[PDB]
Amino acid sequence: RFPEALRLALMLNDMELVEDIFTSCKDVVVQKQMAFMLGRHGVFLELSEDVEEYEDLTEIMSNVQLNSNFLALARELDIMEPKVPDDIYSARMNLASSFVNGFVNAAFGQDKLLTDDGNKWLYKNKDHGMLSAAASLGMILLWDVDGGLTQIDKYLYSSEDYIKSGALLACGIVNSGVRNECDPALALLSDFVLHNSNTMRLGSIFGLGLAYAGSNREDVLTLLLPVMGDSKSSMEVAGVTALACGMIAVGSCNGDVTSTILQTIMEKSETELKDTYARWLPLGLGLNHLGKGEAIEAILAALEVVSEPFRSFANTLVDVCAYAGSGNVLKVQQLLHQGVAVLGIALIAMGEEIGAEMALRTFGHLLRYGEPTLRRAVPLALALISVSNPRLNILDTLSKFSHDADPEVSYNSIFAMGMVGSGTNNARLAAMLRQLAQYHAKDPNNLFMVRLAQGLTHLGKGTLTLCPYHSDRQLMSQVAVAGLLTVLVSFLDVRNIILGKSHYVLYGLVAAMQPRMLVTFDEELRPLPVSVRVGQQTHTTPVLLAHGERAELATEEFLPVTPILEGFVILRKN
Amino acid sequence: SDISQSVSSAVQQYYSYYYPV
Amino acid sequence: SVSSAVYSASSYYYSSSL
Amino acid sequence: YYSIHASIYPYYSYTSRYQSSSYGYG
């Protein structure tokens, strides 16, 4: 009974076990099922070309067919029509609309703004807002590598540097989660990582980080690591480079990135480590050690030389990253600088439900009576612990604290409502956002957060999720966690990172985007309609599961190869 | 907010320190 | 060049297009 | 460490007596 073993092994996070059990099998269709599981988990394992069905197992692992099945389900629902931003309802509102359009139309390669000629929209934006506008094209064309690049290529030759940087970022985005074997992204992006213009460096490096977040490629890391030591690199470029390297090397314990990050910290003046882009350096370090637990002491000891104010931040962030999956009661006691502390409480507690409910009570207490500075991060922790999970109590709390006189609590509460409801058409939440949009009219920043939350609620027109867990809520996608942490750590300085120049980091959410649709196949990977009983009623598949539902097929005619009816399942005959 | 609405057994209401008493 | 095409070796300068 | 009621909270340096500082039991 092979399929269970590979689940348990993937939980153990051990490469050797994964490859040991993914072979040592006398069936092929079971290997195809395990390949679908690995593809969902974002693990790609290299196989010898002499294995019995190398071509198809490789084709499955690289999610090449994901786009076609997703568009097939989009044809079943009859939802291919584009939704302009005004249907959901200054430069800052053009940018807000661009983001709404990108979120809503994600994974359908259609749009009414970025038409055949997108200059008409791009030149209504300016500077970084125009960069993120150009970057949104790659979010609309997600997982469509061939058509994505065919559409993006026109902007790669623009005279405007912001548009070219956004096209580079789009080219990176369209390569996320697909791992095609021709390497279009390394060939297209790698010439700009040391470009003279820093905006080009930011776009190329973030694109490469998103395109290769799955695997710790040695060539991409050797390309990128020099850029943190370049004397022309801004602190923003060094931070983005550390983010990219930690995403690419996430959970790998790669020593050369670790040493490079420590060297880049040790070089920086006590005056520069005050720059808030410096917070991305230990974030990349934690991503490099995410979930490795007690092994982190060696680096905690190496960090002892760092300046005292920065030391608290680096140590806390790296420690809570190392234990992100642990669900350790004692580290939670230690955490019970402060913002990263509460984010680490959520990051650790999300691994089990009793700890998560105690965390929810703690976060409510902190929002009501906590330190005035400490409560600023609490809504982001509430977002992290309950992404794509529209709990009524959480949404009520955030709606209460959505008017708070302290602007950052309001901003973070609104963003947390948008995240919690992401990928769900919840009508209560949509009405809340519409009312808060009427209240926060004539308030550009709160209105911007409201528009972001509105767009995020309708992400994919209801067909996408951001939850990091999958397969019966028992396996954690490290790339999803890395993207979510990138965004929320950037939101611990929302007024200067997100509302400033660097809102392009919101596109890190693409690393966590996944489909929430069930699909059944015959042993030939051919769409096989069956009837299912989705509980916690009947429908004709492919059907959409919500956060906590279990789907069962209501006849004994077919038997599934995997015990878990999540994602893609191959079905045998009697 | 203004406060109607809900108070989690905080009853005068003293829902939080950042709301009018 | 780590950024070129020879199509695609198994089926040009991308930046310059020379 | 207490608070006096406009309201003033010295232990939080916040400006906008409660029986309990943690939960403000009236």
Added chain:
Amino acid sequence: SSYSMHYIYPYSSYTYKYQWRGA
């Protein structure tokens, strides 16, 4: 206005094709 000739790209007017591939 969707392809480039061999170099000229007439949309951007960039001067110095199999869609986005080098061939």
